[model samples]
Target: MISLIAALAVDRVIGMENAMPWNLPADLAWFKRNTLNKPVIMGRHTWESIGRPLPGRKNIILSSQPGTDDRVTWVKSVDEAIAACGDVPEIMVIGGGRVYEQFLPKAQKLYLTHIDAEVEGDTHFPDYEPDDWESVFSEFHDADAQNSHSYCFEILERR
Candidate 1:
């Protein structure tokens, strides 16, 4: 199965300037636990922001540019990414707006961290129809004295 995973604001803003605007330790932990040892596909910019390949996972970066790295498999197209994943049971589509937009339609599941607040950002999530996905799980987390933001972890399956 193909999946898209991301954190976004109420307005669907994903990043302010090619980077996540919010800091949620819980969300990060959730992502690490869920995606560890999986194949993650991302755009070049997303890989650049991360600086290096995440350990314990296969990193595939999609870019039109010509290059290759031991930690990251460079793919020129989505098909190449899929091919790189090869018979992996699940593939995670990590982001950069363009990458998400390209893979959303092909995704069978979506794992999202929806923040309660809205913030201006240049990158945004792709528009998906309500009927296209069914909520499989949702867990709301409230802000506390230590954590200033509220968010929800939502798992959706393609309908």
Candidate 2:
């Protein structure tokens, strides 16, 4: 199965620059814990922004160009990444805007962290009809003494 994980704002803005606009330690921890050791696929820009393959995971970067890297398995297409995943039970599509757009239609599940605040951003998630997915799991985190931002983690399955 293919799953997409991302954090976005009220306006659907994902990033202010190449990096995330907010710092949510808990959310980062959640992502690392859930996706660790899994086959995680991302676009070149996303890989570039992170500067290296995430430790302990099989990193696959989708790029129009091809090259060899000990840490990254570069592929020309999403299908190639899917093929490389082989018998692995699941693959996570981490993002950049274009990569998310390409995989959204085919993704079986979506793990979204929706923030209450909005920020100026260059990248935005694609708009989709709410009926296209069914929310199976969700948790709301209110802004409080420990956390400055309010957000909700949602897991939606394709209908």
Candidate 3:
């Protein structure tokens, strides 16, 4: 039940040293639009990266189970997340790098928003071979006054 999605700058660069350099309102909106209904799995950094669990989507924080927690479901490992989710057809794997690395092998689908420019990045998406994946859907977006970067939203599937 794991799927992957991320918005990475050109050359697969995401953030530099744990912080983002720019604000892409449209990119954030695109993330929300895609992941609204499903449960999301991520680590503490990814959770706190956005300040809190994202609203509307179920948040399954990484790590061991906790008592008295009704909001987020904590699992010791990704292996346990599906059992905890009870047969959800698919779940989105949001990130920081470690979470994406753990879930990439299991992901059949990937939604990558490729930013058209580079930045100094300390983190990146995992190495995925082009021959192993094929683009099935794509929509390019031009840069606007509000959104400074031109980017493409793409959906790829494992070959």
lDDT of each: 0.90, 0.87, 0.83
Writing each residue's lDDT as its tens digit, candidate 3 over 27-98 gives 889899889988888876666667666899888888554523557878878787766766778799888788
Ranking by lDDT, best first?
1, 2, 3
For model 2, the superposed segments whose C-alpha errors exceed 4 Å read: none
Q: Which pairs clash in the backbone of model 3?
A: none
In the range 57-125, model 1's lDDT, one tens digit per residue, is 998999999866776789999999999998989999998899999999899999999988778889999
TM-score of 3: 0.91
In lDDT terms, how accurate is model 2?
Answer: 0.87
Checking candidate 2 for backbone clashes, the offending pairs are none
- Winning model by lDDT: 1
Residue 44 of model 3 has an lDDT of 67
Q: In candidate 1, residue 154 scores what lDDT?
A: 97
Q: lDDT (0-100) at residue 24 of candidate 1?
A: 83
Candidate 2 per-residue lDDT, tens place, 1-159, comes to 999999888789988678877788778887898799899999988888889779998999999987657667989998898998888888999988999999999899999998888689999887867899999999999987766799899999999
Candidate closer to the true structure by TM-score (higher is better), 1 or 2: 1
Q: How does residue 100 of candidate 2 score in lDDT?
A: 93
Superposed Cα deviation of residue 50, candidate 3 (Å): 1.0
Number of clashing residue pairs in every model?
Answer: 0, 0, 0
